[PDB]
Amino acid sequence: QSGGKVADYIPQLAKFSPDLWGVSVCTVDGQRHSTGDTKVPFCLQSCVKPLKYAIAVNDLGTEYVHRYVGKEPSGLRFNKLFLNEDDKPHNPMVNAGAIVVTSLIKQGVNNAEKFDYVMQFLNKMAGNEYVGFSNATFQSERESGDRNFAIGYYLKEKKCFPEGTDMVGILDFYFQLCSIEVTCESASVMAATLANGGFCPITGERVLSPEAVRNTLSLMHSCGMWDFSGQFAFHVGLP
Amino acid sequence: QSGGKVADYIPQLAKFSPDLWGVSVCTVDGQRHSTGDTKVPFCLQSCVKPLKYAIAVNDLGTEYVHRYVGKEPSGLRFNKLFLNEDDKPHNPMVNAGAIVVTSLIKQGVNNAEKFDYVMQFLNKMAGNEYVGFSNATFQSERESGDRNFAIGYYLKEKKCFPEGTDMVGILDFYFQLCSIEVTCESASVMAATLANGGFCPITGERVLSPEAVRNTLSLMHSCGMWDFSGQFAFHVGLP
Amino acid sequence: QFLNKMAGNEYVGFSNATFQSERESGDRNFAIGYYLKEKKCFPEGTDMVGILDFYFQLCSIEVTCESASVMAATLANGGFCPITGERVLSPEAVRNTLSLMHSCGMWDFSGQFAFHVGLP
Amino acid sequence: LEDLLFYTIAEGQEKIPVHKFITALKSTGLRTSDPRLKECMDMLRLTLQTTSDGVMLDKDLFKKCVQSNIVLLTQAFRRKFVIPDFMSFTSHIDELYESAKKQSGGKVADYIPQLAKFSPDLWGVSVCTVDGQRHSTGDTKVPFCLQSCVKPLKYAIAVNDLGTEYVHRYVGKEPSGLRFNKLFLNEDDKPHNPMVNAGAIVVTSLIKQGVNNAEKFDYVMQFLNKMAGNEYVGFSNATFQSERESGDRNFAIGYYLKEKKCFPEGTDMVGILDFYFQLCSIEVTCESASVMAATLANGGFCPITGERVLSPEAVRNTLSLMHSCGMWDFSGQFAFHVGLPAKSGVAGGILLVVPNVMGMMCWSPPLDKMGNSVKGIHFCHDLVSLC
Ligand SMILES: NC(=O)CC[C@H](N)C(=O)O
């Protein structure tokens, strides 16, 4: 297959060649295998949202997490800015829900220790694999991502944020979470910890509560593919 | 629980008592059990749509069925009048998709044989149980149902109908299909034929193809509960 | 300076108290500005944040009713100040802004205002 | 010519096992992950699955297979490298490591609270030579930030890209004699040298002035990766979120420089300051940083790749600047006792350079009151006293 249309916005993402292709496999027990360009690092744009939702749930309880976000598919593009009948984001998967669930994690703590905590937790989840940070793609999407700023200002205007929260710092933190880079082999440990009962497939450590894993699996099955989620559940039927 | 708000439109449907409540259960093997007032007949409004979708798929092939209807959730009420980017209904569960899939079932033959055909399939699925027809709720919702007429005329204006199809007759046939009434015990035989691989749990015969059963099960799991489908999959996770 | 020329050197102040507010609390305007920046409907080489702050400053100007009586009177004339008689606005600009105020100068109430009052 | 050295490795037998071939290769100090011998390494890999003998290499296969690395292997296996008897050198390094482990020091980090989380007993030393010999001990695999140790590197980048006259049009080349946090300029209202914070800010203001930060960081990271031989050059975002909400002396210095109008025309101070924080937030390991200070120990040529990175003029200029004022107020004492071009930082790293011989890296989170690691200074003193 050929496809095309790599990336127009975020010009740092457009520098990748279109013929890059790699697939990594890791099972629950530890059986792993990879082919292609699996050693090349790449960013984790929008793929960290189920992970950060799991972190927020495991830290704060699902009722307190869903006090501010819904659990329904939006039915439109993730860039489209609108709320439900209750003036809330539709799901954590879309940009508004991602911003709100970034607001929940460690509300009384500054950005540096928040990033340190989430990076330590994700490294524990990854079995101390390679988890980097592409600062080149963080300088981009910050000076060029304008739709996310509009969504954040709309959410601040609708007063859907938790009290005593700065919108600009939370949006920058969300950009930092989106700017995390992993390889395909390192991301094979991802989607395997939550494929298990919250335990790491390699180290066997206790990482996530089973409730958080079940909730994020249900959310990925429901609206984990934007408008293509219905067709994906119809044909593939996998989270 | 109490609830409230029985039915505003379809004034024939508003005559039911608010404390009326019963549950019937039937399994794949054949054993069944029911409690309460299960013998009382009631209309199958908006519940026959997975059944008619299964009939249409089993008779026409899923590619020809989905040539006109998409397979994505809408995210809004079933009475809402809008289409997707491709000027098509989002899914067969909403009213527009139901109208389009009723337009496909035996398009070359008039209503008199079409109703007999779908009633024969419904009786074969039900194992010759009670499948009645509440004419009182068919005379109502035809003189008072106005949103369906607007939706059908919008679909005709968008030219999403098959060639050589009358809008008014197909809409009347859709009303007739929605006006079919069954009891709780009789409807318990339904949703068990498609719980099996298309085989009737009572007669042991074959009714539906496994592909049609899988397709309608996936669609009902995805967007079979309107805007509450996401919450239903989150909490219950059953079609 | 030009608005003072239009006002005939009347009282035109600047309420800084209402400028500090609506800057830390006006969030819908920021969303609109970022949406316009995302849609690329700005002139080339223009900073969105500074332009939005300038727009807030223009909205933060304060005048009295007597000073605002000279307002809507230079443009009620042929662009000349009713008091000083100086050349202020070109007649084309006055005609265009009068037509725009007559058309959509009252938000959703503009149609009813033109139906009943029928004045810009 | 490879046959005689292969027979010298051999004891008379024509067939030599691969286990014997990898034996004593570590004695030569050349690691197996060198891209120069990546042809030979890929040869060994492909012959390991397909040999039909089991762990064998044979003379004639070695003769026919090696087609581009004859010179390097001949220089390596006849002890033609600049540092012979590498076992004695590693024993000396281990003895100095054991001697330096006795000291305690203290005062790890007060400001940048993310930097204060490091263990005070962490200690590691990495060594790399010009030819390609390398050896590391201790905690050499732990990543750490390159705070103030990237300033000679960015100065070399700026000089190599802009010319020394254009670089020094804005920055002087004299030591200051005070701390790097001190806010003052020279008689001509210019930063004293690129090593202190003001000079670092001004030289970050010069690199690709017409391009935004997104491509500037990619450019400097490409140069750093070419210098490091595609080793681990990461980015610690945790220490970049800190030192931005808590680093106030740098903001005051930047505003003072903006007031003095020493910046190039059409430059935004805040963006350049953020880019400077990003440049100082780059993290590396001791092994990865050992590849650095060896490219500039050579004539701008990377010891691992063998390619060309920097002009010799830039290398000479940054070596002279590191020799002159590479240790803040301790530069005079360091030249008096050690007399080698080295650069320190608030992280704890020491970029000790021996010109045309070998490069080093010493990591110690505890710091002196002046701004240098106590263990690294003691290690350098013991090294210059012994060898
Ligand atoms: N040694 C250093 O000062 C490192 C530079 C760093 N930006 C700081 O101001 O701390």
Author numbering:
A (entry chain A), B (entry chain B): 241 to 479
C (entry chain C): 360 to 479
D (entry chain G): 139 to 525
Task: List passages from the publication reporting this PDB structure.
The glutaminase enzymes GAC and GLS2 catalyze the hydrolysis of glutamine to glutamate, satisfying the ‘glutamine addiction’ of cancer cells. All glutaminase enzymes share a catalytic domain containing identical active site residues and a conserved mechanism for hydrolyzing glutamine to glutamate. Here we demonstrate that the ability of GAC and GLS2 to form filaments is directly coupled to their catalytic activity and present their cryo-EM structures which provide a view of the conformational states essential for catalysis. Filament formation guides an ‘activation loop’ to assume a specific conformation that works together with a ‘lid’ to close over the active site and position glutamine for nucleophilic attack by an essential serine.
